[PDB]
Symmetry: D2
Subunit: 256 residues, 4 copies
């Protein structure tokens, strides 16, 4: 099934997670052809500033994600930052997410694969599409079976990311490909939000196995990625649109 | 609104090659009535990498060949100019005067095209930020151009590589109609190539543009220029049908500028 | 001899040219080991804005440059923008300059070579160093004998240029290499001026055949490139510095 | 001020390789008394492209080998950490804890290095703008680091290529001492390579930095990692003499931060 990974950027509170989870559950009931995966980070490990919000800890995070999976029966995904976190997180995460900056850390990938869960690696901003082949192989070596590669932009000069859509067909040669519509338009360190929907449309017209989107009831108040999180109320309309585009465009997806 | 499809062989190899592609384009224009087709071919490749590559058969010959195409098929014409003096003679036959990517900033060339009264299509330089096309349009308006197009053809990304930053489509749409060049955007000046033409063109129409530009040739492998990226003529119909379908389903979601 | 190409960006007036020419003449007398070339554009053919200063015309420009060469006996260089301008300009220009954006225009290069003068091509911002081989060959084909390639930065994301110093040894394989210290730090369309001297030092430590620098009595009032033109009073100090660095570093210039 | 030269084999292939390079570095430290030499070698290559490449002989083995070097030659030591828990044991022997380029933003790793009391050298990420290293330094100061270095090792430039934007040297100098990594800056992740090490290092000292980082190996072609860019041990002396000479003549022109 087509994948839609969505949720608030950071686990600001179990409350926020349950509110977003409700809406995702509802959409889950509405779009049965789509496999929804609830996503949220228990820790923002590389905020620019030491004074910025990181989170409430792994334990509290796994707990809240457990509440979401229990209350709504939704699959879960969260990102790990050091090898030791793989196991505890795998208790609740159906898919373990590997941060873009850490996509080359062999030990992190192996610890993810060992848990037996699915692994979704965010393609580093410094990484060429063809060089993700080795990332996938490390994971296979470590016993991984369900492997995803997520396109999230590429370093383009300073404080800018460009999305090279040629990467989708290239990465598809060795893994299921996910398009990160949120982080692909943010400026590291223009007008971010206005480009999220247009690029999402491009991703499905080109061909991918799923889309990743951060969403918040009130993006304006988000403690992380405030400028790019999609207002929860707009999620349905966007999903309906990509399914329609996908339905027509899929006829032309090149074999691979 | 009528979607624009600019297509044709990269270079005017002969009047014969032109009439051949022209006939196929004429046929598709009869089928895709919702599309405005414009026949394209350069009378001169003014910046081949090597001094030993094919340039063309001259301005006079090119214009005459292009005139034959318009005459025989009733097709609109577009070709590119390389120096100011060429605008006048070229405007005799060209409905749209094209400005090469490297020359998108040359004021005199822009003014020369503008005062002919013809439409003007500027290829966005590989070095140019989407927001900096605003002044290129201003120059044209200042020069008398009433119909202006900006063509997305990729941006310098490291050495011998171009990337297409699709954010440029809605940015440039603020001041001109936008065309997506499906051929030159996948070329490696000096990823691979042809295998990416179709997927990137699908992305372009999903994002939203006013037209697409595609070089096509009966036998790409024998073309005297851009043999690697020129689309096989027989594949044109399918590509066009596909983009009209994607455009239609995506259209209700195009943002308002 | 080591080359130093300097002068005001645009021929704002014969007056300005003579004032800058005087100082350049003086430095010419002071640094006999250096071949000074007076540079100034009779036309700024690609200003961002239609309302910006372009110049006073080719005729007036060639006239003023003639006054400089006559009054101070300094060699001359100016840039052409269309093929027809090569011949009239070659009457006074010892070196014909090919704009960076036009470095691939075969007809412009051939018209430059035909005049018999020296040709200095500004490496396009889109051009890889190894791809300048073909530029040089076009010129040789057209009869050019004294050929220079000028490093002036490379497109690095939007509105930014980076200087890849690997380009100097690479281009030296087929032409004399000049480093443009002025345009290499400007932001197309950070803090420009503060980086001019540091990068100039790098260029000579690496190894080049000359340096290109725009200078103005009062950069602040320049009608073109106001933010990057070097104050005339600082030129001597910079030249003395690059000669000293060159004297020590030249011992290590790799053979080629 | 004492110029820093950080050098050594890329990976701790064996305690024997270490003592060999160590002896040469000890010898140069006796000749170049105006230089502070720091012996470098990774106990682990935590991010080889392939799962089949050499990683190392483990933390315990590495630290012990590095300790032997410090013990036998009285040389300062530096090595890189990959996870927070490694900072403490590594600080036992390392005078400078190095933070890998890809991890330059990992707050916990930075804090872990900072609280050891050792000096900290951060490799500037290939994705990081020079001005964004300011917050990396802030994190370290916050964590207790009193001696901080930022290492220039190139920036992503298209695919499989890095460019060195020398404007970064004076920018980063605003908040930390700066080191130029002569080895990794010419590497093509995943121009050519070794032929550019020396020229770029000359540019670095002409611009101005507080030290240079260079991987050297008795026989580069046999190294288990970075064989292509590791400098032949016999060439180290000459490279160092050359940069001290260029540094000296350029020094009076170094701008004040
Ligand atoms: O094939 P070479 O000779 O490199 O030429 C490339 C160009 O002619 C052409 O693709 C470019 O679009 C022209 O501006
Ligand atoms: O040679 P491969 O396996 O590609 O590895 C590159 C890296 O180990 C190394 O050069 C990089 O500096 C490590 O961070």
């Amino acid at each position: 099934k087509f994948l839609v990974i969505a949720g608030p950027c950071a686990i600001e509170s179990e409350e926020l997670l349950l509110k977003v989870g409700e809406e995702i559950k509802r959409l889950s009931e509405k779009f049965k052809e789509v496999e929804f995966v609830f996503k949220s980070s228990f820790d923002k490990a590389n905020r620019s500033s030491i004074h910025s919000f990181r989170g409430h800890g792994l334990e509290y995070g796994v707990k809240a994600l457990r509440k979401v999976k229990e209350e709504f029966g939704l699959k879960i995904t969260t990102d790990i930052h050091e090898s030791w976190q793989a196991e505890p997180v795998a208790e609740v995460a159906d898919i373990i997410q590997i941060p873009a900056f850490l996509c080359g850390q062999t030990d992190l990938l192996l610890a993810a694969a060992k848990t037996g869960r699915a692994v979704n690696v965010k393609k580093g901003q410094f990484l060429a599409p063809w060089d993700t082949k080795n990332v996938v192989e490390k994971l296979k070596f470590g016993g991984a079976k369900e492997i995803y590669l997520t396109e999230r932009g590429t370093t383009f000069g300073y404080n800018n990311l460009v999305v090279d859509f040629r990467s989708l067909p290239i990465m598809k040669q060795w893994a299921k490909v996910i398009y990160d519509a949120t982080h692909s338009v943010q400026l590291p360190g223009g007008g971010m939000r206005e480009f999220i929907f247009p690029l999402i449309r491009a991703a499905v017209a080109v061909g991918c196995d799923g889309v990743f989107m951060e969403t918040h009831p009130e993006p304006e108040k988000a403690l992380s990625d405030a400028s790019t999180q999609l207002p929860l109320s707009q999620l349905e309309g966007i999903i309906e649109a990509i399914l329609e585009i996908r339905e027509v465009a899929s006829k032309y997806y090149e074999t691979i």
